[PDB]
Design a protein around this motif. Structure first.
Motif, PDB file in Angstrom:
ATOM      1  N   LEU A  12       0.243 -10.543  -7.232  1.00 22.06           N
ATOM      2  CA  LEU A  12      -1.084 -10.611  -6.628  1.00 22.06           C
ATOM      3  C   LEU A  12      -1.009 -10.578  -5.101  1.00 22.06           C
ATOM      4  O   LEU A  12      -2.035 -10.743  -4.431  1.00 22.06           O
ATOM      5  CB  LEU A  12      -1.861 -11.842  -7.089  1.00 22.06           C
ATOM      6  N   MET A  13       0.155 -10.348  -4.528  1.00 22.75           N
ATOM      7  CA  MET A  13       0.225 -10.395  -3.068  1.00 22.75           C
ATOM      8  C   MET A  13      -0.222  -9.083  -2.430  1.00 22.75           C
ATOM      9  O   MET A  13       0.093  -7.993  -2.881  1.00 22.75           O
ATOM     10  CB  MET A  13       1.633 -10.688  -2.534  1.00 22.75           C
ATOM     11  N   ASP A  14      -0.945  -9.231  -1.322  1.00 26.17           N
ATOM     12  CA  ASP A  14      -1.064  -8.212  -0.294  1.00 26.17           C
ATOM     13  C   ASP A  14      -0.059  -8.539   0.791  1.00 26.17           C
ATOM     14  O   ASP A  14      -0.320  -9.376   1.642  1.00 26.17           O
ATOM     15  CB  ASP A  14      -2.473  -8.202   0.283  1.00 26.17           C
ATOM     16  N   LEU A  15       1.126  -7.906   0.725  1.00 26.26           N
ATOM     17  CA  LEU A  15       2.213  -8.319   1.585  1.00 26.26           C
ATOM     18  C   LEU A  15       2.010  -7.723   2.981  1.00 26.26           C
ATOM     19  O   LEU A  15       1.692  -6.541   3.124  1.00 26.26           O
ATOM     20  CB  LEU A  15       3.530  -7.821   0.989  1.00 26.26           C
ATOM     21  N   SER A  16       2.131  -8.565   3.992  1.00 23.56           N
ATOM     22  CA  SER A  16       1.913  -8.089   5.355  1.00 23.56           C
ATOM     23  C   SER A  16       3.027  -8.631   6.236  1.00 23.56           C
ATOM     24  O   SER A  16       3.604  -9.650   5.878  1.00 23.56           O
ATOM     25  CB  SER A  16       0.564  -8.499   5.895  1.00 23.56           C
ATOM     26  N   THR A  17       3.318  -7.956   7.360  1.00 24.93           N
ATOM     27  CA  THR A  17       4.424  -8.351   8.225  1.00 24.93           C
ATOM     28  C   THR A  17       4.213  -9.767   8.730  1.00 24.93           C
ATOM     29  O   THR A  17       3.051 -10.095   9.047  1.00 24.93           O
ATOM     30  CB  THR A  17       4.583  -7.378   9.394  1.00 24.93           C
ATOM     31  N   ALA A  37       0.995  -6.498  -5.308  1.00 23.73           N
ATOM     32  CA  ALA A  37      -0.172  -5.678  -5.604  1.00 23.73           C
ATOM     33  C   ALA A  37      -0.380  -4.602  -4.539  1.00 23.73           C
ATOM     34  O   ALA A  37      -0.844  -3.469  -4.779  1.00 23.73           O
ATOM     35  CB  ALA A  37      -1.375  -6.569  -5.682  1.00 23.73           C
ATOM     36  N   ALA A  38      -0.128  -5.007  -3.304  1.00 19.84           N
ATOM     37  CA  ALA A  38      -0.447  -4.176  -2.151  1.00 19.84           C
ATOM     38  C   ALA A  38       0.485  -4.509  -1.002  1.00 19.84           C
ATOM     39  O   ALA A  38       1.135  -5.549  -0.978  1.00 19.84           O
ATOM     40  CB  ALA A  38      -1.907  -4.401  -1.743  1.00 19.84           C
ATOM     41  N   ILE A  39       0.467  -3.636   0.012  1.00 21.95           N
ATOM     42  CA  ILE A  39       0.875  -4.012   1.365  1.00 21.95           C
ATOM     43  C   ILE A  39      -0.359  -3.939   2.275  1.00 21.95           C
ATOM     44  O   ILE A  39      -1.289  -3.195   1.993  1.00 21.95           O
ATOM     45  CB  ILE A  39       1.996  -3.094   1.880  1.00 21.95           C
ATOM     46  N   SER A  40      -0.322  -4.705   3.365  1.00 26.23           N
ATOM     47  CA  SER A  40      -1.370  -4.678   4.370  1.00 26.23           C
ATOM     48  C   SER A  40      -0.777  -4.217   5.685  1.00 26.23           C
ATOM     49  O   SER A  40       0.197  -4.806   6.139  1.00 26.23           O
ATOM     50  CB  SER A  40      -2.031  -6.022   4.535  1.00 26.23           C
ATOM     51  N   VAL A  41      -1.445  -3.224   6.302  1.00 26.15           N
ATOM     52  CA  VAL A  41      -0.957  -2.651   7.549  1.00 26.15           C
ATOM     53  C   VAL A  41      -2.155  -2.303   8.414  1.00 26.15           C
ATOM     54  O   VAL A  41      -3.256  -2.137   7.902  1.00 26.15           O
ATOM     55  CB  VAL A  41      -0.059  -1.407   7.363  1.00 26.15           C
TER      56      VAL A  41
END
Ligand SMILES: *C/C=C/c1ccc([N+](=O)[O-])cc1
Length: 243
Positions: A12-17, A37-41
């Motif tokens: 379920l994560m939106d992984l971001s730096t 689930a996603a990455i965030s950029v």
């Protein structure tokens, strides 16, 4: 069962730096126990992220980005232009910042109109819209509910606690309040919830999911209805799972 909750939270994560950082984020999203689930950029990084995700055989990891961010200014035209650009770059999802200072100044209408304009852009491109209400700046329970309500009415696909750029991000209490609005509005089928910040550990993630489980049942919090983002959380989840 901490391992079971940690695996669920991870997915379920939106992984971001720089490109090197985006590329590394994408790699990190492909974990030994599954994909986030996603990455965030930022919008400008969407093309290189898409290429990287494709090249590593994880084309189903979503690409989320942020607009009107992190300020939540009340200029609809700017927020909309940013959102159209995010779409054009190739976003799967756009997390827009609600005009929370405007709402604290008694202007509910601009939050409605801003979200609506961005939702309309998103929906025409099959992009989901998350709305960041900035619970840590609103502070007051009634303001958190109102912002959540206006966002839902305007068509938010998700309501999200926080930008991660102010001192106070998610808490269990603000998460509860927001998910109570979803329930009270009757929109749990169409509207997800995202926790940003306040979720440093596996144990924290389990608590946040438990709130959702208790309000909606244990099947509700799939990736269309629940997301997590927080620095350090992925490492904590992996550690719980033995990595
Ligand atoms: C809720 C999303 C927050 C956020 C912060 C920073 C970035 N980024 O570094 O691209 C993405 C999303």
């Amino acid at each position: 069962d901490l391992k079971a909750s940690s695996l669920r939270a991870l997915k379920l994560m939106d992984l971001s730096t720089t490109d090197e950082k985006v590329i590394a984020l994408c790699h990190q999203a492909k974990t030994p126990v599954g994909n986030t689930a996603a990455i965030s950029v930022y919008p400008r990084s969407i093309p290189i992220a898409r290429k990287t995700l494709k090249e590593q055989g994880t084309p189903e990891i979503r690409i989320a980005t942020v607009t009107n961010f992190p300020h939540g200014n009340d200029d609809i035209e700017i927020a909309l232009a940013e959102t159209r650009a995010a779409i054009a770059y190739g976003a799967d999802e756009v997390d827009v910042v609600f005009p929370y200072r405007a709402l604290m100044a008694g202007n509910e209408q601009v939050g409605f109109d801003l979200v609506k304009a961005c939702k309309e852009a998103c929906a025409a491109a099959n992009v989901l819209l998350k709305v960041i209400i900035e619970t840590g700046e609103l502070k007051d329970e009634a303001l958190i509910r109102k912002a959540s309500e206006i966002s839902i009415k305007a068509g938010a696909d998700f309501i999200k606690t926080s930008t991660g750029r102010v001192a106070v991000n998610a808490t269990p209490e603000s998460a509860r309040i927001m998910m109570e609005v979803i329930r009270d509005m009757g929109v749990e089928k169409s509207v997800g919830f995202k926790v940003t910040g306040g979720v440093s550990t596996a144990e924290d993630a389990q608590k946040y999911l438990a709130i959702a489980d208790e309000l909606f049942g244990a099947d509700w919090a799939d990736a269309r209805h629940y997301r997590f983002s927080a620095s350090g959380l992925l490492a904590s989840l992996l550690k719980a799972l033995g990595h």
